[PDB]
Design a protein around this nucleic acid. Structure first.
Ligand SMILES: Nc1ccn([C@H]2C[C@H](O)[C@@H](COP(=O)(O)NP(=O)(O)OP(=O)(O)O)O2)c(=O)n1
Ligand SMILES: [Mg+2]
Length: 431
DNA sequence: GCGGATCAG
DNA sequence: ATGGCTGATCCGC
Protein backbone atom coordinates (compact mmCIF):
# COMPACT_ATOMS: atom_id res chain seq x y z
CA UNK A 1 0.00 0.00 0.00
CA UNK A 2 1.14 3.58 -0.86
CA UNK A 3 2.65 5.85 1.86
CA UNK A 4 -0.16 8.37 1.28
CA UNK A 5 -2.77 5.53 1.35
CA UNK A 6 -1.53 4.30 4.81
CA UNK A 7 -1.47 7.56 6.88
CA UNK A 8 -5.03 8.14 5.53
CA UNK A 9 -6.58 4.82 6.68
CA UNK A 10 -5.19 5.31 10.19
CA UNK A 11 -6.54 8.91 10.24
CA UNK A 12 -9.93 7.41 9.21
CA UNK A 13 -10.00 4.81 12.00
CA UNK A 14 -8.09 6.89 14.56
CA UNK A 15 -9.83 10.33 14.28
CA UNK A 16 -12.23 11.19 17.13
CA UNK A 17 -10.77 8.68 19.64
CA UNK A 18 -10.02 9.51 23.26
CA UNK A 19 -6.42 8.38 22.55
CA UNK A 20 -6.24 10.63 19.47
CA UNK A 21 -7.36 13.67 21.48
CA UNK A 22 -4.42 13.11 23.81
CA UNK A 23 -2.00 12.80 20.87
CA UNK A 24 -3.07 16.27 19.70
CA UNK A 25 -2.74 17.66 23.23
CA UNK A 26 0.83 16.26 23.18
CA UNK A 27 1.67 17.52 19.70
CA UNK A 28 0.56 21.02 20.89
CA UNK A 29 2.80 20.69 24.00
CA UNK A 30 5.60 19.75 21.53
CA UNK A 31 5.01 22.57 19.04
CA UNK A 32 4.96 25.06 21.92
CA UNK A 33 8.37 23.75 23.05
CA UNK A 34 9.58 24.23 19.44
CA UNK A 35 8.28 27.81 19.17
CA UNK A 36 9.99 28.71 22.48
CA UNK A 37 13.33 27.41 21.21
CA UNK A 38 12.84 29.56 18.10
CA UNK A 39 12.00 32.66 20.21
CA UNK A 40 15.24 31.83 22.09
CA UNK A 41 17.24 31.42 18.82
CA UNK A 42 16.12 34.87 17.62
CA UNK A 43 17.67 36.49 20.73
CA UNK A 44 21.20 35.06 20.05
CA UNK A 45 23.88 37.54 18.84
CA UNK A 46 26.68 36.84 16.36
CA UNK A 47 29.08 37.53 19.25
CA UNK A 48 27.63 34.74 21.46
CA UNK A 49 27.58 32.36 18.48
CA UNK A 50 31.31 33.17 17.94
CA UNK A 51 32.18 32.75 21.67
CA UNK A 52 30.41 29.37 21.52
CA UNK A 53 32.04 28.24 18.23
CA UNK A 54 35.51 28.44 19.84
CA UNK A 55 34.29 26.71 23.06
CA UNK A 56 32.73 23.82 21.03
CA UNK A 57 35.73 23.59 18.63
CA UNK A 58 38.14 23.40 21.57
CA UNK A 59 36.06 20.45 22.86
CA UNK A 60 35.69 18.85 19.39
CA UNK A 61 39.48 18.98 18.96
CA UNK A 62 39.74 17.12 22.33
CA UNK A 63 37.23 14.45 21.13
CA UNK A 64 38.79 14.03 17.67
CA UNK A 65 42.19 13.63 19.32
CA UNK A 66 40.77 10.92 21.63
CA UNK A 67 39.11 9.01 18.69
CA UNK A 68 39.75 5.24 18.71
CA UNK A 69 39.57 2.95 15.67
CA UNK A 70 41.45 -0.02 17.17
CA UNK A 71 38.38 -1.93 18.41
CA UNK A 72 36.00 -4.10 16.38
CA UNK A 73 32.33 -3.85 17.45
CA UNK A 74 29.53 -6.09 16.27
CA UNK A 75 25.82 -5.51 16.79
CA UNK A 76 23.49 -8.49 16.24
CA UNK A 77 19.71 -7.90 15.83
CA UNK A 78 17.33 -10.81 15.05
CA UNK A 79 15.05 -10.31 12.08
CA UNK A 80 11.29 -10.04 12.77
CA UNK A 81 12.12 -11.96 15.94
CA UNK A 82 8.78 -12.87 17.50
CA UNK A 83 7.15 -13.23 14.06
CA UNK A 84 9.99 -15.33 12.69
CA UNK A 85 9.71 -17.73 15.64
CA UNK A 86 5.99 -18.13 15.06
CA UNK A 87 6.61 -18.56 11.34
CA UNK A 88 9.32 -21.15 12.09
CA UNK A 89 7.01 -23.33 14.14
CA UNK A 90 3.99 -23.02 11.81
CA UNK A 91 4.77 -23.49 8.07
CA UNK A 92 1.18 -22.45 7.17
CA UNK A 93 2.20 -18.84 8.10
CA UNK A 94 5.38 -18.74 5.87
CA UNK A 95 4.13 -17.14 2.63
CA UNK A 96 1.58 -14.84 4.41
CA UNK A 97 1.33 -11.59 6.49
CA UNK A 98 1.37 -11.93 10.30
CA UNK A 99 1.83 -9.96 13.48
CA UNK A 100 2.70 -11.06 17.00
CA UNK A 101 0.41 -9.59 19.63
CA UNK A 102 -3.24 -9.04 20.47
CA UNK A 103 -6.04 -7.01 19.03
CA UNK A 104 -5.08 -4.39 21.68
CA UNK A 105 -1.39 -4.12 20.63
CA UNK A 106 1.31 -5.68 18.43
CA UNK A 107 4.89 -6.45 19.42
CA UNK A 108 6.15 -6.89 15.81
CA UNK A 109 5.17 -7.98 12.28
CA UNK A 110 6.88 -9.97 9.50
CA UNK A 111 8.11 -8.18 6.40
CA UNK A 112 5.07 -9.35 4.37
CA UNK A 113 2.86 -7.45 6.81
CA UNK A 114 4.99 -4.37 6.95
CA UNK A 115 4.55 -3.85 3.23
CA UNK A 116 0.95 -2.95 4.37
CA UNK A 117 2.23 -0.51 7.05
CA UNK A 118 1.65 -2.66 10.16
CA UNK A 119 4.51 -2.41 12.66
CA UNK A 120 5.59 -2.60 16.32
CA UNK A 121 3.67 -0.64 18.97
CA UNK A 122 0.62 -0.40 16.64
CA UNK A 123 -2.69 -1.66 18.04
CA UNK A 124 -4.02 -4.83 16.36
CA UNK A 125 -7.43 -3.44 15.35
CA UNK A 126 -5.71 -0.71 13.28
CA UNK A 127 -3.41 -3.23 11.64
CA UNK A 128 -6.53 -5.23 10.61
CA UNK A 129 -7.72 -2.08 8.80
CA UNK A 130 -4.33 -1.85 7.05
CA UNK A 131 -4.64 -5.54 6.20
CA UNK A 132 -7.75 -7.64 6.97
CA UNK A 133 -5.87 -10.65 5.60
CA UNK A 134 -3.56 -10.28 8.73
CA UNK A 135 -3.10 -13.19 11.09
CA UNK A 136 -2.41 -12.03 14.65
CA UNK A 137 -0.67 -14.76 16.78
CA UNK A 138 -0.53 -14.37 20.59
CA UNK A 139 3.00 -13.96 21.99
CA UNK A 140 4.82 -16.98 23.48
CA UNK A 141 7.40 -15.08 25.52
CA UNK A 142 8.88 -18.27 27.01
CA UNK A 143 9.84 -19.56 23.57
CA UNK A 144 11.38 -16.22 22.72
CA UNK A 145 13.40 -16.26 25.94
CA UNK A 146 14.55 -19.81 25.08
CA UNK A 147 15.58 -18.83 21.55
CA UNK A 148 17.49 -15.88 22.99
CA UNK A 149 19.31 -18.34 25.30
CA UNK A 150 20.32 -20.38 22.22
CA UNK A 151 21.87 -17.34 20.46
CA UNK A 152 23.57 -15.92 23.54
CA UNK A 153 25.39 -19.30 23.74
CA UNK A 154 26.89 -18.75 20.26
CA UNK A 155 27.76 -15.10 21.00
CA UNK A 156 29.64 -16.11 24.17
CA UNK A 157 32.33 -17.79 21.96
CA UNK A 158 33.31 -14.55 20.28
CA UNK A 159 32.91 -12.18 23.24
CA UNK A 160 32.28 -13.74 26.65
CA UNK A 161 31.91 -10.16 28.01
CA UNK A 162 29.26 -9.39 25.36
CA UNK A 163 26.25 -7.38 26.49
CA UNK A 164 22.65 -8.09 25.42
CA UNK A 165 20.22 -5.17 24.94
CA UNK A 166 17.13 -7.37 24.81
CA UNK A 167 16.29 -10.91 23.71
CA UNK A 168 16.86 -10.14 19.97
CA UNK A 169 19.73 -7.69 20.39
CA UNK A 170 23.39 -7.65 21.56
CA UNK A 171 26.68 -5.75 21.19
CA UNK A 172 29.96 -7.73 20.93
CA UNK A 173 33.61 -6.79 21.22
CA UNK A 174 35.44 -9.16 18.85
CA UNK A 175 38.89 -7.53 19.11
CA UNK A 176 40.33 -10.14 21.51
CA UNK A 177 38.86 -12.91 19.28
CA UNK A 178 39.98 -11.48 15.91
CA UNK A 179 43.50 -11.30 17.39
CA UNK A 180 43.40 -14.99 18.41
CA UNK A 181 41.68 -15.99 15.14
CA UNK A 182 44.45 -14.72 12.79
CA UNK A 183 46.59 -17.75 13.57
CA UNK A 184 43.86 -20.46 13.81
CA UNK A 185 43.81 -23.64 11.63
CA UNK A 186 40.83 -24.34 9.33
CA UNK A 187 39.66 -27.15 11.70
CA UNK A 188 38.85 -24.64 14.52
CA UNK A 189 36.63 -22.53 12.18
CA UNK A 190 34.78 -25.22 10.17
CA UNK A 191 31.03 -25.81 10.62
CA UNK A 192 29.01 -28.67 9.10
CA UNK A 193 25.67 -27.97 7.27
CA UNK A 194 22.36 -29.13 8.89
CA UNK A 195 28.93 -31.43 3.72
CA UNK A 196 31.12 -28.92 5.68
CA UNK A 197 32.04 -25.18 5.43
CA UNK A 198 34.97 -22.97 6.68
CA UNK A 199 34.91 -19.23 7.28
CA UNK A 200 37.69 -16.65 7.00
CA UNK A 201 39.93 -14.74 9.41
CA UNK A 202 38.37 -11.28 8.69
CA UNK A 203 35.76 -9.34 10.68
CA UNK A 204 33.23 -9.66 7.84
CA UNK A 205 33.80 -13.45 7.99
CA UNK A 206 33.65 -13.81 11.83
CA UNK A 207 30.23 -12.17 11.66
CA UNK A 208 29.18 -14.40 8.72
CA UNK A 209 30.04 -17.27 11.12
CA UNK A 210 27.90 -15.93 13.88
CA UNK A 211 25.00 -15.38 11.48
CA UNK A 212 25.50 -18.86 9.96
CA UNK A 213 25.64 -20.72 13.29
CA UNK A 214 22.51 -18.89 14.49
CA UNK A 215 20.59 -19.97 11.35
CA UNK A 216 21.75 -23.58 11.87
CA UNK A 217 20.90 -23.71 15.58
CA UNK A 218 17.57 -21.78 15.58
CA UNK A 219 16.45 -21.85 11.90
CA UNK A 220 16.18 -18.04 12.13
CA UNK A 221 18.00 -15.14 10.44
CA UNK A 222 19.79 -12.22 12.05
CA UNK A 223 21.34 -9.00 10.70
CA UNK A 224 24.61 -7.48 11.89
CA UNK A 225 26.64 -4.27 12.00
CA UNK A 226 30.44 -4.07 12.14
CA UNK A 227 32.12 -0.79 13.14
CA UNK A 228 34.78 0.69 15.43
CA UNK A 229 32.23 1.88 18.07
CA UNK A 230 28.79 0.83 19.40
CA UNK A 231 26.76 3.79 18.16
CA UNK A 232 28.00 3.15 14.63
CA UNK A 233 27.59 -0.64 14.72
CA UNK A 234 24.00 -0.17 15.86
CA UNK A 235 23.22 2.02 12.80
CA UNK A 236 24.68 -0.25 10.07
CA UNK A 237 23.09 -3.29 11.76
CA UNK A 238 19.78 -1.94 10.39
CA UNK A 239 21.21 -1.04 6.92
CA UNK A 240 21.27 -4.43 5.15
CA UNK A 241 18.39 -5.85 7.21
CA UNK A 242 17.12 -8.51 6.98
CA UNK A 243 19.72 -11.29 6.78
CA UNK A 244 22.68 -9.02 5.96
CA UNK A 245 25.79 -7.33 7.29
CA UNK A 246 27.59 -4.06 6.87
CA UNK A 247 31.06 -2.95 7.86
CA UNK A 248 32.43 0.52 8.43
CA UNK A 249 36.15 -0.15 7.95
CA UNK A 250 38.43 1.11 10.77
CA UNK A 251 39.73 4.28 9.11
CA UNK A 252 38.71 7.91 9.72
CA UNK A 253 37.63 8.54 6.12
CA UNK A 254 35.21 5.59 5.80
CA UNK A 255 33.54 6.59 9.09
CA UNK A 256 33.00 10.11 7.78
CA UNK A 257 31.86 8.90 4.35
CA UNK A 258 28.93 7.12 6.05
CA UNK A 259 28.08 9.78 8.65
CA UNK A 260 28.02 12.50 5.94
CA UNK A 261 24.42 11.93 4.75
CA UNK A 262 23.06 9.78 7.60
CA UNK A 263 19.75 11.08 8.93
CA UNK A 264 19.77 11.90 12.66
CA UNK A 265 16.57 9.83 13.09
CA UNK A 266 18.49 6.62 12.23
CA UNK A 267 20.62 7.07 15.37
CA UNK A 268 19.77 5.29 18.62
CA UNK A 269 18.82 8.08 21.03
CA UNK A 270 17.32 10.55 18.53
CA UNK A 271 13.58 9.84 18.61
CA UNK A 272 10.53 11.45 17.01
CA UNK A 273 10.47 14.59 19.15
CA UNK A 274 14.19 15.32 18.94
CA UNK A 275 13.97 14.71 15.15
CA UNK A 276 11.26 17.39 14.89
CA UNK A 277 13.19 19.83 17.12
CA UNK A 278 16.42 19.49 15.16
CA UNK A 279 14.40 19.55 11.90
CA UNK A 280 13.12 22.98 13.01
CA UNK A 281 16.75 24.22 12.81
CA UNK A 282 17.18 22.69 9.33
CA UNK A 283 19.10 19.72 10.82
CA UNK A 284 18.18 16.42 9.17
CA UNK A 285 21.63 14.77 8.56
CA UNK A 286 24.72 14.26 10.75
CA UNK A 287 26.90 16.85 8.94
CA UNK A 288 24.15 19.47 9.42
CA UNK A 289 24.35 18.53 13.11
CA UNK A 290 28.12 19.28 12.95
CA UNK A 291 27.67 22.58 11.13
CA UNK A 292 25.23 23.98 13.71
CA UNK A 293 27.26 22.70 16.76
CA UNK A 294 27.71 26.24 18.13
CA UNK A 295 24.01 27.11 17.79
CA UNK A 296 23.34 23.73 19.51
CA UNK A 297 25.63 24.56 22.45
CA UNK A 298 23.41 27.59 23.28
CA UNK A 299 19.93 26.06 22.67
CA UNK A 300 20.51 22.62 24.29
CA UNK A 301 21.90 21.55 27.62
CA UNK A 302 25.48 20.46 28.21
CA UNK A 303 24.73 16.71 28.21
CA UNK A 304 22.57 17.03 25.08
CA UNK A 305 25.01 18.93 22.80
CA UNK A 306 27.95 16.86 24.10
CA UNK A 307 25.99 13.83 22.95
CA UNK A 308 25.04 15.54 19.62
CA UNK A 309 28.71 16.29 18.95
CA UNK A 310 29.86 12.68 19.55
CA UNK A 311 27.20 11.78 16.95
CA UNK A 312 28.34 14.57 14.55
CA UNK A 313 31.91 13.25 14.56
CA UNK A 314 30.83 9.57 14.38
CA UNK A 315 32.21 8.76 17.84
CA UNK A 316 30.75 6.41 20.43
CA UNK A 317 31.52 3.71 22.99
CA UNK A 318 34.40 1.31 22.14
CA UNK A 319 34.43 -0.94 25.26
CA UNK A 320 31.27 -2.65 26.53
CA UNK A 321 30.85 -1.59 30.17
CA UNK A 322 29.44 -4.53 32.19
CA UNK A 323 25.72 -4.38 33.05
CA UNK A 324 25.59 -2.38 36.32
CA UNK A 325 23.15 -2.96 39.19
CA UNK A 326 19.50 -1.97 38.57
CA UNK A 327 18.16 1.37 39.75
CA UNK A 328 14.40 0.65 39.68
CA UNK A 329 11.84 -2.14 39.46
CA UNK A 330 8.21 -1.70 38.42
CA UNK A 331 4.89 -3.17 37.40
CA UNK A 332 1.90 -1.63 35.58
CA UNK A 333 -1.26 -2.96 33.98
CA UNK A 334 -4.02 -1.79 31.62
CA UNK A 335 -7.68 -2.71 32.08
CA UNK A 336 -11.21 -1.67 31.13
CA UNK A 337 -12.30 1.31 33.19
CA UNK A 338 -12.12 1.20 36.98
CA UNK A 339 -13.94 3.91 38.96
CA UNK A 340 -15.13 2.21 42.18
CA UNK A 341 -12.42 3.33 44.65
CA UNK A 342 -12.34 0.10 46.72
CA UNK A 343 -11.48 -1.82 43.54
CA UNK A 344 -8.71 0.72 42.78
CA UNK A 345 -7.18 0.06 46.21
CA UNK A 346 -7.48 -3.76 45.78
CA UNK A 347 -5.73 -3.45 42.41
CA UNK A 348 -2.97 -1.25 43.88
CA UNK A 349 -2.56 -3.95 46.53
CA UNK A 350 -2.21 -6.63 43.85
CA UNK A 351 0.37 -4.65 41.89
CA UNK A 352 2.22 -3.93 45.12
CA UNK A 353 2.31 -7.69 45.88
CA UNK A 354 3.59 -8.57 42.43
CA UNK A 355 6.29 -5.94 42.72
CA UNK A 356 7.20 -7.30 46.17
CA UNK A 357 7.53 -10.85 44.77
CA UNK A 358 9.83 -9.49 41.98
CA UNK A 359 12.14 -7.84 44.57
CA UNK A 360 12.13 -11.08 46.58
CA UNK A 361 13.59 -12.85 43.51
CA UNK A 362 16.60 -10.45 43.37
CA UNK A 363 16.69 -9.78 47.15
CA UNK A 364 16.44 -5.99 46.74
CA UNK A 365 14.87 -3.35 48.94
CA UNK A 366 14.24 0.34 48.30
CA UNK A 367 13.24 3.69 49.75
CA UNK A 368 11.11 5.43 47.08
CA UNK A 369 7.71 4.08 46.10
CA UNK A 370 6.08 5.62 43.04
CA UNK A 371 2.52 5.03 41.77
CA UNK A 372 1.44 5.68 38.18
CA UNK A 373 -2.17 6.42 37.18
CA UNK A 374 -3.52 6.80 33.68
CA UNK A 375 -7.11 8.01 33.22
CA UNK A 376 -9.55 7.09 30.40
CA UNK A 377 -8.43 10.12 28.31
CA UNK A 378 -4.78 8.84 28.47
CA UNK A 379 -3.50 11.49 30.86
CA UNK A 380 -0.74 10.02 33.02
CA UNK A 381 0.06 11.06 36.58
CA UNK A 382 2.90 9.77 38.71
CA UNK A 383 3.09 10.25 42.45
CA UNK A 384 6.10 9.37 44.55
CA UNK A 385 7.22 9.27 48.14
CA UNK A 386 10.65 8.58 49.64
CA UNK A 387 10.87 7.06 53.11
CA UNK A 388 13.73 7.06 55.65
CA UNK A 389 13.56 3.33 56.29
CA UNK A 390 14.24 0.88 53.44
CA UNK A 391 11.06 -1.07 52.40
CA UNK A 392 10.42 -4.35 50.52
CA UNK A 393 7.39 -6.45 51.62
CA UNK A 394 4.01 -6.40 49.90
CA UNK A 395 2.50 -4.67 52.96
CA UNK A 396 5.13 -1.91 53.29
CA UNK A 397 4.86 -1.03 49.64
CA UNK A 398 1.06 -1.11 49.76
CA UNK A 399 1.15 0.94 52.94
CA UNK A 400 2.96 3.75 51.12
CA UNK A 401 1.11 3.39 47.78
CA UNK A 402 -2.36 3.31 49.49
CA UNK A 403 -1.78 6.84 50.88
CA UNK A 404 -0.48 8.19 47.58
CA UNK A 405 -3.50 6.75 45.84
CA UNK A 406 -5.77 8.17 48.59
CA UNK A 407 -4.39 11.69 48.13
CA UNK A 408 -5.41 11.44 44.45
CA UNK A 409 -8.96 10.11 44.99
CA UNK A 410 -9.56 12.78 47.65
CA UNK A 411 -8.19 15.44 45.27
CA UNK A 412 -11.00 14.96 42.69
CA UNK A 413 -13.73 14.24 45.38
CA UNK A 414 -16.65 14.05 44.66
CA UNK A 415 -15.57 12.85 41.24
CA UNK A 416 -14.25 9.29 40.91
CA UNK A 417 -10.94 8.68 39.18
CA UNK A 418 -11.70 6.94 35.90
CA UNK A 419 -8.53 4.88 35.46
CA UNK A 420 -7.51 2.65 32.59
CA UNK A 421 -4.03 1.87 33.97
CA UNK A 422 -2.26 1.79 37.31
CA UNK A 423 1.36 1.06 38.17
CA UNK A 424 3.77 0.79 41.08
CA UNK A 425 7.55 1.34 40.94
CA UNK A 426 10.16 1.03 43.66
CA UNK A 427 13.55 2.81 43.51
CA UNK A 428 16.43 4.37 45.55
CA UNK A 429 18.30 1.17 46.27
CA UNK A 430 21.57 1.24 48.36
CA UNK A 431 24.90 2.96 47.46
C1' DG B 1 13.62 14.65 45.52
C1' DC B 2 9.32 15.12 42.11
C1' DG B 3 6.73 15.04 38.13
C1' DG B 4 6.46 15.21 33.37
C1' DA B 5 8.59 13.36 28.95
C1' DT B 6 11.39 10.94 25.67
C1' DC B 7 13.44 6.80 24.12
C1' DA B 8 14.55 2.05 23.61
C1' DG B 9 12.99 -2.85 21.94
C1' DA C 1 -15.33 -2.67 21.28
C1' DT C 2 -10.60 -3.26 21.30
C1' DG C 3 -4.42 2.36 21.70
C1' DG C 4 1.17 -2.70 25.79
C1' DC C 5 4.83 -3.51 28.71
C1' DT C 6 9.93 -2.30 31.78
C1' DG C 7 13.81 0.46 32.75
C1' DA C 8 16.88 4.39 32.02
C1' DT C 9 17.56 9.11 31.62
C1' DC C 10 16.91 14.14 31.17
C1' DC C 11 14.86 18.76 31.77
C1' DG C 12 12.98 22.15 34.62
C1' DC C 13 11.80 23.07 38.89
N1 LIG D 1 7.75 -1.55 20.78
C1 LIG D 1 8.17 -2.84 20.74
C2 LIG D 1 9.25 -3.17 19.93
C3 LIG D 1 9.70 -4.49 19.87
N2 LIG D 1 9.09 -5.45 20.60
C4 LIG D 1 9.58 -6.85 20.54
C5 LIG D 1 9.15 -7.49 19.23
C6 LIG D 1 10.44 -7.65 18.42
O1 LIG D 1 10.43 -8.89 17.69
C7 LIG D 1 11.55 -7.64 19.46
C8 LIG D 1 12.85 -7.04 18.93
O2 LIG D 1 12.58 -5.77 18.33
P1 LIG D 1 13.38 -5.20 17.05
O3 LIG D 1 14.75 -5.75 16.99
O4 LIG D 1 13.45 -3.69 17.17
N3 LIG D 1 12.54 -5.59 15.72
P2 LIG D 1 12.15 -7.04 15.09
O5 LIG D 1 12.95 -8.08 15.73
O6 LIG D 1 10.67 -7.33 15.25
O7 LIG D 1 12.51 -7.00 13.57
P3 LIG D 1 13.73 -6.33 12.84
O8 LIG D 1 13.70 -4.85 13.10
O9 LIG D 1 15.02 -6.92 13.39
O10 LIG D 1 13.62 -6.61 11.38
O11 LIG D 1 11.03 -6.85 20.55
C9 LIG D 1 7.99 -5.10 21.42
O12 LIG D 1 7.40 -5.98 22.11
N4 LIG D 1 7.56 -3.81 21.48
MG1 LIG E 1 14.98 -7.33 15.53
Amino acid sequence: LDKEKINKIIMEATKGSRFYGNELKKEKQVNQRIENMMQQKAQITSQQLRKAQLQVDRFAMELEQSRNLSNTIVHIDMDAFYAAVEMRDNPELKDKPIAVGSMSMLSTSNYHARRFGVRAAMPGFIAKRLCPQLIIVPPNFDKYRAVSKEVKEILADYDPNFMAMSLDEAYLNITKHLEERQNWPEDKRRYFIKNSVVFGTSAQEVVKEIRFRIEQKTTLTASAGIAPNTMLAKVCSDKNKPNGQYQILPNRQAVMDFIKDLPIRKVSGIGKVTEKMLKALGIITCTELYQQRALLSLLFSETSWHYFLHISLGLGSTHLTRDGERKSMSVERTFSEINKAEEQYSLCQELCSELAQDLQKERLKGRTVTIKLKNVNFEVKTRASTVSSVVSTAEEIFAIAKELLKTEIDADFPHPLRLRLMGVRISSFPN
